[PDB]
Design a protein around this ligand. Sequence first.
Ligand SMILES: Nc1ncnc2c1ncn2[C@@H]1O[C@H](COP(=O)(O)OP(=O)(O)OP(=O)(O)O)[C@@H](O)[C@H]1O
Lengths: 363, 52, 171
Amino acid sequence: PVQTGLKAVDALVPIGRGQRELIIGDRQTGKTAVALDTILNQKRWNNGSDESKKLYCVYVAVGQKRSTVAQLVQTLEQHDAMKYSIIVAATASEAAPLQYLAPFTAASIGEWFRDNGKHALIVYDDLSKQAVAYRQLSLLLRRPPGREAYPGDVFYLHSRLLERAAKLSEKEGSGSLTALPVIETQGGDVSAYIPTNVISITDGQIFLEAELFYKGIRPAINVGLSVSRVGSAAQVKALKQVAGSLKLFLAQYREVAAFAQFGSDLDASTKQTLVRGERLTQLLKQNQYSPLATEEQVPLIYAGVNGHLDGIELSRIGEFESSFLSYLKSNHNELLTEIREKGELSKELLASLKSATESFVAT
Amino acid sequence: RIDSVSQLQNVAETTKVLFDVSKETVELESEAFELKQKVELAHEAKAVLDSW
Amino acid sequence: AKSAANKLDWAKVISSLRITGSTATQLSSFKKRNDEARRQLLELQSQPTEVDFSHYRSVLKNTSVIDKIESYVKQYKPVKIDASKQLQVIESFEKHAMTNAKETESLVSKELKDLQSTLDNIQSARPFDELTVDDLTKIKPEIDAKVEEMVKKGKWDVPGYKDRFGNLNVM
Ligand SMILES: Nc1ncnc2c1ncn2[C@@H]1O[C@H](COP(=O)(O)OP(=O)(O)OP(=O)(O)O)[C@@H](O)[C@H]1O
């Protein structure tokens, strides 16, 4: 697992070491914050001692402003990520073949950590400006454009970039490199020529739709679109035990999304699923710079799945999160250590967790 | 009335333990208050020496 | 070992189900939740409360103050002590509590067996189709008192009677 620390990411769309996942979205819709929260979540192991659990972060800003990269370095030194960060900056003041080159050189930086046994995460941000720089370099050398004037080999560019990232087996030293490219689309589109080439390389999408961030639900993962292909074989075992309904349950809630807009009175089952779906939608919100480790992602999702939230009003859920977390931090600390060590819920762990839920649920 | 009698059967025996252990868990954390003093002075020292 | 305290608190929560309208008792548990959730983040949040004289003093090449504020920390290294001052007042509060508790505990233990005795007396002493009203006068002089006052005032109407017991007359 690559524990991103977000609730909804590790709930629904898990990331494996060596699984190229795409963060696609729109302009000013919360794209960079997912990668930044993942880099800040890797502080759980970068302070630690085992190498094979550390996870080095290489953030590769292309096409962005100088001052944005300045604030991002300042952010990664507030929360102390700069003992393991590598910033490759190719800011938009500088000219085009620098931007054509800089993610590739950062992929060489990633391959150095890959061949030498260690594990490392890289974040391309954002390759829709790399293809801007590449169409600039191929429309100044008379090479004729293709569909929407990206030149005809622009599939090959993101190919030869993202294919230098996978999981090496034991024969080469069990190192890895995992990539999160970021694609800026145009108005919720998933069918221009560029975002239908990054999708046809990476192993899945986290489609950060603008409409949900317009309702403030940040991060705004559209659940029914965001999927991962080899995520499921590499999730933490505990979340895979207590969220095997959660994807199907949000699919169920998405089925009755447009059916309840009629305002018609319905049966009991759709009202039950509607209340639990609204509690889960309000539940997966998260403030900036607070990634929750998997040892705390399991009980919150566990309280979400098994109907315990249904007596609470909808506005209290945001403080229910921090209240139930501090309730488990003060009293049932041994359960959090069990989830930390074992990474798996046995039957006794499950019953103790159900008791510890129903305790705090009762008030 | 037998039921409303039988609910309060062993309750005083338990709330003479509730009382003590609850007030102990309340008032054994001014320890942590005087720990906080030692915390925040070292935080101020770390802040100014980072400025240095 | 705090889980015994919190387990007995939730035991008193499912026992404070029996008294709806708790004013500040759950608010007292809220205050212990407040500072107990505060103290754990306070102890996990801090660094080792010291200036790292090995690495972090050798950083500043033009040092001149790190030994000064090092000595200032070691001056205030006996920082400030707490207070378990309560050994006079807290014994008074638990004294009043244990007094009321033992009174209530012995009282309900008496009253349970008194109602069990009343149930046992009720089972074997209901001669309901053959009881004499003279025995009711003998068990209650309230009977004869109300009857005599009722004749002396003259309220021959018995109120509250016609509903469950019929008037039974011809008209
Ligand atoms: N969890 C959160 N808490 C608070 N603010 C958030 C959160 N997530 C996103 N935001 C807001 O989203 C805004 C933009 O964040 P972000 O940079 O990820 O968007 P973006 O589309 O990546 O922008 P750009 O593409 O220019 O980098 C920020 O101002 C931030 O305040």
